[PDB]
Amino acid sequence: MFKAVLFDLDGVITDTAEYHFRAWKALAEEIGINGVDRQFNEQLKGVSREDSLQKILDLADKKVSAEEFKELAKRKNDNYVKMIQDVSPADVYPGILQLLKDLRSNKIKIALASASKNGPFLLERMNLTGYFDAIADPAEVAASKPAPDIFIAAAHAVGVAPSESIGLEDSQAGIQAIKDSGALPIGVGRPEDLGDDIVIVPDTSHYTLEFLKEVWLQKQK
């Protein structure tokens, strides 16, 4: 049986993209740029802070100095940190808490494999820290997803080889990282987005210890 489960944060444990939205909306409003609404915020899924800021400046065909651009990106981060004070256990996706409990009670290791620079804070706000055996520090990984580095780090941090692990992800880049680490991917989403060659569930309520065990056994033959 698998010995560890390696979780991304955004799209699996919780949605952080909503707080990123509030932070950008606040910045846009402060600098007098209209049009940062929920629809626009879809154009920011998977997008860097720097690329996101440029898309916001583009709403007003606005050109800024490199120093001002840096300062605006900093202010957005300051805003995001304020916004996420409101994260709570209500933010936890369906099925996830019961999964974490069941993994823990069965002595299956639990690690976070997220690019989030706020991962530990966000797990604490959601009252989940006590379930995690490790959090892979994204500041210590050389290469981001789709590179397998973060998943390899998460597995190692709980004393397992990735080959002993399942990885849960909602993004194509993250599924590729799981694959290339040697861990078994189980995606949440659609094959159109994630790939046609892995097991996928439609939402996180399907991530049960029973289902994971079934998939693991089905994939060992």
Interface residues toward Mg ion, by CB under 5 A: 8, 10-11, 170-171
Q: What angle do CA 123, 126, 129 make, to 5 degrees?
A: 40
**Cβ closest to Mg ion, residue 26 vs residue 116:** 116
Known binding-site residues for beta-D-glucose 6-phosphate equal 10, 46-47, 49, 116-118
Q: CA 182, CA 151: separation in Å to the nearest integer?
A: 9
CB of 34: closest distance to Mg ion in angstroms?
Answer: 29
* Closest residue by beta carbon to Mg ion: 11
* Nearest-angstrom CA–CA distance, 22 and 140: 28
Is 10 catalytic? The answer is yes
Residue in 10, 86, 137, 149 annotated catalytic: 10
Distance CA 80, CA 166 (A): 30
Concerning whether 8 is annotated as a catalytic residue, the answer is: yes
Nearer to Mg ion, 31 or 199 (CB): 199
CB nearer to Mg ion: pick between 11 and 138: 11
Distance CA 5, CA 29 (A): 41
In the complex, what is the shortest distance from the CB of residue 209 to Mg ion, in angstroms, rounded to a whole number? 21
Torsion of Cα atoms, 11 then 3 then 162 then 143, to 10°: 40
Q: Could you list the residues known to form a binding site for Mg(2+), using ranges.
A: 8, 10, 170
CB of 174 to Mg ion, least distance (A): 5
Rounded CA separation 80/20 (Å): 6
Catalytic residue numbers read 8, 10
